[PDB]
Design an enzyme around this catalytic site. Structure first.
Site, PDB file in Angstrom:
ATOM      1  N   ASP A  35       0.623   7.856   5.383  1.00  0.00           N
ATOM      2  CA  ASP A  35       1.850   8.441   5.609  1.00  0.00           C
ATOM      3  C   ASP A  35       2.870   6.402   6.049  1.00  0.00           C
ATOM      4  OD1 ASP A  35       4.607   8.860   6.116  1.00  0.00           O
ATOM      5  OD2 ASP A  35       4.422   8.908   7.999  1.00  0.00           O
ATOM      6  N   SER A 199      14.057   0.221  -7.538  1.00  0.00           N
ATOM      7  CA  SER A 199      13.719   0.717  -9.522  1.00  0.00           C
ATOM      8  C   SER A 199      14.517   0.447  -9.862  1.00  0.00           C
ATOM      9  CB  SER A 199      13.225   2.175  -9.408  1.00  0.00           C
ATOM     10  OG  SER A 199      13.420   2.892 -10.922  1.00  0.00           O
TER      11      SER A 199
END
Length: 330
Positions: A35, A199
């Site tokens: 994770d 992004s």
């Protein structure tokens, strides 16, 4: 040194991925959920409340000659999905794909929430976010990666998750045969303890690319792609009959649909998520309403590039002095 381990979807939907991890001496192999959005290595154990164990493999520290109680240490964690666990702490030898760390903090669960009990395939979590998020008290502990880093050939790990198929976690090297083209690297903020990046925009299907900054985290421990409501609405508007369902808890779509792809930007590069990656199947057995793999982050407070996004790429988690993230197509 290096390590290389195969990671395998837990079910036919790729709801999560499990990777075998050797703990203790002799080795006890547990299948952990790696994770990159948390920083605790915790396991089901011989200390876990009996009624809260249902099929998981347990770590038994009393059977490990290298286990040592970390005196006075406790841990307690809550995840973004409302699940939680807590317990005490041992140090022991932990190996992943041939890479060994001695003295790793192994957090033994005394209690786990229902969602963990109900998932027989996940024996614990191995956190790969920054150690500043580790919950051990009163002395915070380091992640497996942080402990391994100095010994690694290069201070990196990579995630290569498969679509409906196994994939690979590598430590200490970049497998140049595992991706196409080049790897585009992008800046990371560690201010919140995550692999947080920005992004450069998105496209829906064959549509034009929208240049827009989307801050979010690369999180292998989250199944879906969570993005701003504007972006998510633009995606689902291209699927006839798709709608946000308050009762189901997100966007659903007719199972008869053909889903468009979704592209996200990494600098000037583009990662394309095929439409099929966005299908999470019937909302309940036999239903013709299917659950979407792109969902709104509104009210999460952060955008999350979870498995839906990451499995479309070869992803480099670069833990150099100034960390960065790399993405390549594959």
């Amino acid at each position: 040194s290096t390590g290389s381990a195969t990671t395998t979807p837990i079910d036919s939907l790729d709801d999560a991925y499990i990777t075998p991890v050797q703990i203790g001496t002799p080795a006890q192999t547990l299948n952990l959920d790696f994770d990159t959005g948390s920083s605790d290595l915790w396991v089901f154990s011989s200390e876990t409340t009996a009624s809260e164990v249902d099929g998981q493999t347990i770590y038994t520290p009393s059977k490990s000659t290298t286990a040592k109680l970390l005196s006075g240490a406790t841990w307690s964690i809550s995840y973004g999905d409302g699940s939680s666990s807590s317990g005490d702490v041992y140090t022991d030898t932990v190996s992943v794909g041939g890479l060994t760390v001695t003295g790793q903090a192994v957090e033994s669960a005394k209690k786990v929430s229902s969602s963990f009990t109900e998932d027989s395939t996940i024996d614990g979590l191995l956190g790969l976010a920054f150690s500043t998020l580790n919950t051990v008290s009163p002395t915070q502990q380091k992640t497996f990666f942080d402990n391994a880093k100095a010994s690694l050939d290069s201070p990196v790990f990579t995630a290569d998750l498969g679509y409906h198929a196994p994939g690979t976690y590598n430590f200490g090297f970049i497998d140049t045969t595992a991706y196409t083209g080049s790897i585009t690297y992008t800046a990371v903020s560690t201010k919140q303890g995550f692999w947080e990046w920005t992004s450069t925009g998105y496209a829906v299907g064959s549509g034009t690319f929208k240049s827009t900054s989307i801050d979010g985290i690369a999180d292998t421990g989250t199944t879906l792609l969570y993005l701003p409501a504007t972006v998510v609405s633009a995606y689902w508007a291209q699927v006839s009959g798709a709608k946000s369902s308050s009762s189901v808890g997100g966007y659903v779509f007719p199972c008869s649909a053909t889903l468009p792809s979704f592209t996200f930007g990494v600098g000037s590069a583009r990662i394309v998520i095929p439409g099929d990656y966005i299908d999470f199947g019937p909302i309940s057995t036999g239903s013709s309403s299917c659950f979407g793999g792109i969902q709104s982050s509104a009210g999460i407070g952060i955008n999350i590039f979870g498995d839906v996004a990451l499995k479309a790429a070869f992803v480099v988690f670069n833990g150099a002095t100034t960390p960065t993230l790399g993405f390549a197509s594959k």
